[PDB]
Design an enzyme around this catalytic site. Structure first.
Site, PDB file in Angstrom:
ATOM      1  N   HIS A   1      15.285  25.492  65.513  1.00 13.34           N
ATOM      2  CA  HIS A   1      14.907  26.701  64.789  1.00 13.34           C
ATOM      3  C   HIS A   1      15.386  26.708  63.341  1.00 13.34           C
ATOM      4  CE1 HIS A   1      18.851  28.500  66.375  1.00 13.34           C
ATOM      5  NE2 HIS A   1      18.889  28.890  65.114  1.00 13.34           N
TER       6      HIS A   1
ATOM      7  N   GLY B   1      25.306  31.777  61.590  1.00 11.32           N
ATOM      8  CA  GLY B   1      25.472  30.469  61.003  1.00 11.32           C
ATOM      9  C   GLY B   1      26.219  29.476  61.867  1.00 11.32           C
TER      10      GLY B   1
ATOM     11  N   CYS C   1      25.066  28.293  64.794  1.00 10.35           N
ATOM     12  CA  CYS C   1      24.162  27.431  65.540  1.00 10.35           C
ATOM     13  C   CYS C   1      24.347  25.973  65.143  1.00 10.35           C
ATOM     14  CB  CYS C   1      22.712  27.855  65.315  1.00 10.35           C
ATOM     15  SG  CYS C   1      22.368  29.365  66.234  1.00 10.35           S
TER      16      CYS C   1
END
Lengths: 299, 299
Positions: free
Chosen positions: B40, B142, B144
């Site tokens: 993503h 942030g 991920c």
């Protein structure tokens, strides 16, 4: 979410070596061309009861120390003693040496521990310096020389080197200048600590953490003065709360809109009544090893 | 006496990078000449409710991906999607690549998480995969691409990569082959975790730990079948045991001489009668986030 969080340990892993003298093996910290380790590496089983360290050290040569970084032996070219820490000068500098400082922490402050065995890192966890200057660690045989540390903008602040276990299962050690935290001595005797207390400013920080994450059953509409809170705190063997502590809690107070003295009133109610079987952030017990800084950073 | 202990994080720190598309930055894992990250990263906010990842990727070229180790750019020379992970081939092999494996863990297993932001590690902590395939992490915007791992004899087994948060505040993600744990998808849609249950194999590990430390009032002279125990366990919202669970309790059963199904009978009695105001390992609550391996380590 909220968990006990340690600093990343890579900068310290790059400094851990094995130090051996006789049949005694433990860990050392290799910074620039010096290896720091507990001085009791020079003892034998008969020495450890009442060791005269100055006498024991003068009888040692540089070649009696075996320092190993991995498979590689490092040649000891000099040795000295600073309080309870031995400093071995080696001929090679550690290229992995981080920016660092040696600090002595205050009781109530937290730090990360890198537990090592035979110079090899094994685990990392967060500890607090107890008010009675013990630490509740996980240290087994061979863990001596493991260090505790904090990190601030790539700078590693070393604050603890591990030396001993007490009969109650808690631990004791020194700063990197070799001075013990607490009334302890590096001799092989069963030593008791003074009565411990609970770190009040940290419990308050953790309650604010429980609120930030939506746990609120313990809040109340009541309030309290600072002195009246401190009277009740001391009765339950909690540390008194200073005005500096109140100030340190401001950011968490603002973030939640809960005045510090309001949270003090909630903690007072928990001390007097208990948790009535309920839990906070999963715990059945009030947690006092998160500082205000710890909670903020993670929230 | 027991605490959550993480693995030393240094081998993983040496693999963390940042991956940016436009203004969207998350973390990636750099091993040999491949960077792994959540797919993503290629989404704008408009794409995230119902992304067409296949279509979004067709419009991407190598030169659209900014990969950085610190502030140093790593040029991307190929890209592909594997399930929910993006794989970016880069022109430099990571010199800090450890010996590693990609493993898919089972519910109840524990692992260390290196929480990272902008490719920089912030902290390390221990997580358990819940039976509903969520973890109770500490993750902010942030985070991920942060990974979970275990270390066995210098080899890093990567098991988790972080992708999202669920409304209840728990976290969800994939293995390093990009297959989600649980029934979740990487869309910015409201998703629900199944009701959680207690990790029975870890509670049994905890009881073995208590016995090892001399705390054994709960042992009884009875046994049970695995099926009978599993049927009772479910009525108390405990996970049923698998054959793999029985096998990984083997070492602790050997260490204590208490057969697994005898310990199950003691646990069944605890579930049906409660603790009668007693404690185990200084707790009125049974712990379920220590695996049999965790216990062995600390004991």
């Amino acid at each position: 979410g909220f968990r006990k969080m340690a600093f990343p340990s890579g900068k310290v892993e790059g400094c851990m070596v094995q130090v051996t003298c006789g049949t005694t093996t433990l860990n050392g910290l290799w910074l620039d061309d010096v290896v720091y380790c507990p001085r009791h590496v020079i003892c034998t089983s008969e020495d450890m009861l009442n060791p005269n360290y100055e006498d024991l050290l003068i009888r040692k040569s540089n070649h009696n120390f075996l320092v190993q970084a991995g498979n590689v032996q490092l040649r000891v070219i000099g040795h000295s003693m600073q309080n309870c820490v031995l400093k071995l000068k080696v001929d090679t500098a550690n290229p992995k040496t981080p920016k660092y400082k040696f600090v002595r922490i205050q009781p109530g402050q937290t730090f990360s521990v890198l537990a090592c065995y035979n110079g090899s890192p094994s685990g990392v966890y967060q500890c607090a310096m107890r008010p009675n200057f013990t630490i509740k660690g996980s240290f087994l045989n061979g863990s001596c020389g493991s260090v505790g540390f904090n990190i601030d903008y790539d700078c590693v602040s070393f604050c603890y080197m591990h030396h001993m276990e007490l009969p109650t299962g808690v631990h004791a050690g020194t700063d990197l200048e070799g001075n013990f935290y607490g009334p302890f001595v590096d001799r092989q005797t069963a030593q008791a600590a003074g009565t411990d207390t609970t770190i009040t400013v940290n419990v308050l920080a953790w309650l604010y953490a429980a609120v930030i994450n939506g746990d609120r059953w313990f809040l109340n509409r009541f309030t309290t003065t600072l002195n009246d809170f401190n009277l009740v705190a001391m009765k339950y063997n909690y540390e008194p709360l200073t005005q500096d502590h109140v100030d340190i809690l401001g950011p968490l107070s603002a973030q939640t809109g809960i005045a510090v003295l309001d949270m003090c009133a909630s903690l007072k109610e928990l001390l007097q009544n208990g948790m009535n079987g309920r839990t906070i952030l999963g715990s059945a017990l009030l947690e006092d090893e998160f500082t205000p800084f710890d909670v903020v950073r993670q929230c």
